[PDB]
Amino acid sequence: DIQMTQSPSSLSASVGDRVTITCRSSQRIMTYLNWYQQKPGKAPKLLIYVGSHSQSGVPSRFRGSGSETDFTLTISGLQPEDSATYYCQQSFFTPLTFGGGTKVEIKRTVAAPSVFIFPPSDEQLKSGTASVVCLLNNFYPREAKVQWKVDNALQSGNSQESVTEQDSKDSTYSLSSTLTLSKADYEKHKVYACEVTHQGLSSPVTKSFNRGEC
Amino acid sequence: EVQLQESGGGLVQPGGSLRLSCAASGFTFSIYSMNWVRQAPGKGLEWVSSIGSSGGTTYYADSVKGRFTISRDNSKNTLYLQMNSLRAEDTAVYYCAGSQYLYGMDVWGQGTTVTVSSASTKGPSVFPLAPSSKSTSGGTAALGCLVKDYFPEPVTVSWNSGALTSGVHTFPAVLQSSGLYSLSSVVTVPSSSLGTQTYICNVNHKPSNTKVDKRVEPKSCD
């Protein structure tokens, strides 16, 4: 079983930069190594086959090289759409083995999030639970702090965060923070606020609503 | 246009059987070697099985040998994967891929999800996400839908039946302590359009056969 060692596991490079992804095989496989690109939510796509061969339609920035047990994929002139995961695959003999993958992040200029807060719907409240959602839209880098406050009470341990994969056009992230309370507890308080800290904001931004104020 | 269309995925009980299909078009199927590749949730690509262009040769990963059977019908331009004695660790998205080059994968299918669990399939509750009247948004506002408490993955969310795509963000699902999934789908739109234009989130959960079209609009505030 030929083991495929791919390195680095991740990298972050700016648009127009030149990045290299390496793939090593435990045994000689001549030139029978293929490279695939997998964008978020999409099926894998072939970039390079048999070491260095590409189809007319694969950008000139995608070039493969190597032989025996050392292979390289070079992206010369990174583009926003190149944000994806890349895998090598030996097509020498079975079992066919893939590399562990390399996540390519596009390093762009700082972008502050646009913050939005959503109260729980009356429909959900009928079920005896209240979800309060704070959205941070289109920001970079991924590092962001979201803190919930209920009647000035600092909330901890009752929220969950989810972050999208980097956008293919603007290279930004979006983040959702969901605060979960029972209806009874929701109805005991008035002010619900989410405060966001991010390197793109001159100082923290706070968005809030008051319960029962349509 | 070389094309591979899969089908047959779904939710299966441990030890049960399932047969995947993959229809080919746009090339001489009889000269292409075919493969199955799978991707566990949040994991890398894993080779499953390979079959020669004529069907006289087959290859299998050690983890599926004796349980999976790859086959093809060159008269119908179809590839199959018969999965028996299914295990929980077989859960993944399954892809068919092939090439005129042996063990290559030049044309890929869109993928089909296979979930192996003894848990019960449950449809989500869909709740609106809309701001209150005193929201301090500028010229851009946000709406969304909360898709809560469903199992298993995945769910598909669209807006206005696909007519609205720009500015949409459907977040990755989070596994709650209950063992159920929950996610939010949001879309940013001009503020002036918030209280007038139609915004409908279309949710489809095929495992539980739960499909919903929910209109999202701010609360009445006269």
Residue numbers in the entry:
A (entry chain B): 1 to 214
B (entry chain A): 1 to 222
Please give the exact wording used by the authors of the publication that reports this structure.
The antibodies described in the present study target the oxidized macrophage migration inhibitory factor (oxMIF), the activated and disease related isoform of the macrophage migration inhibitory factor (MIF). MIF to oxMIF conversion exposes hidden epitopes within the compact MIF homo-trimer, enabling specific binding of anti-oxMIF antibodies. However, this study revealed that imalumab exhibits an unusually short half-life of only 2.3–7.3 days (56–176 h) in humans and showed a non-linear pharmacokinetic (PK) dose relationship, indicating some intrinsic limitations of this first-generation anti-oxMIF antibody. By combining in silico analysis with experimental validation, we identified surface hydrophobicity and aggregation propensity as the underlying causes of the unusually short half-life of the first generation anti-oxMIF antibody imalumab.
To assess the impact of the specified point mutations (LC: F49Y/A51G/W93F; HC: L5Q/W97Y) on the overall structure, the Fab region of C0083 was recombinantly expressed, purified, and crystallized. Despite the overall similarity, the H:CDR3 of C0083 was completely restructured due to the mutation H:W97Y, while the L:CDR3 containing the mutation L:W93F did not differ substantially from imalumab. However, the L:W93F mutation in L:CDR3 facilitates an interaction between L:F93 and L:I2, which are now approximately 3 Å apart. This interaction led to a significant decrease in the solvent-accessible surface area (SASA) of L:F93 (C0083, L:F93: 70.9 Å2 vs. imalumab, L:W93: 157.0 Å2), resulting in reduced exposure of this hydrophobic amino acid. In the completely restructured H:CDR3, H:Y97 adopted a new conformation and occupied the space originally taken by H:Y99 in the parent Fab. The altered loop conformation enabled an interaction between H:Y97 and L:Y49, and significantly shifted the position of H:Y99. In imalumab, H:Y99 was prominently exposed on the surface, whereas in C0083, it is now buried near L:T94, resulting in a significant reduction in the calculated SASA of H:Y99 in C0083 (21.4 Å2) compared to imalumab (110.4 Å2). With only minimal modifications compared to imalumab, it maintained specificity and affinity for oxMIF in the low nanomolar range while exhibiting significantly reduced hydrophobicity and aggregation potential due to the H:L5Q/W97Y and L:F49Y/W93F mutations. Additionally, the L:A51G mutation reduced immunogenicity by eliminating a high-affinity T-cell epitope. The structural analysis of C0083 Fab employing X-ray crystallography demonstrated that the reorganization of the heavy chain CDR3 loop was a crucial factor in the observed enhancement of biophysicochemical characteristics.
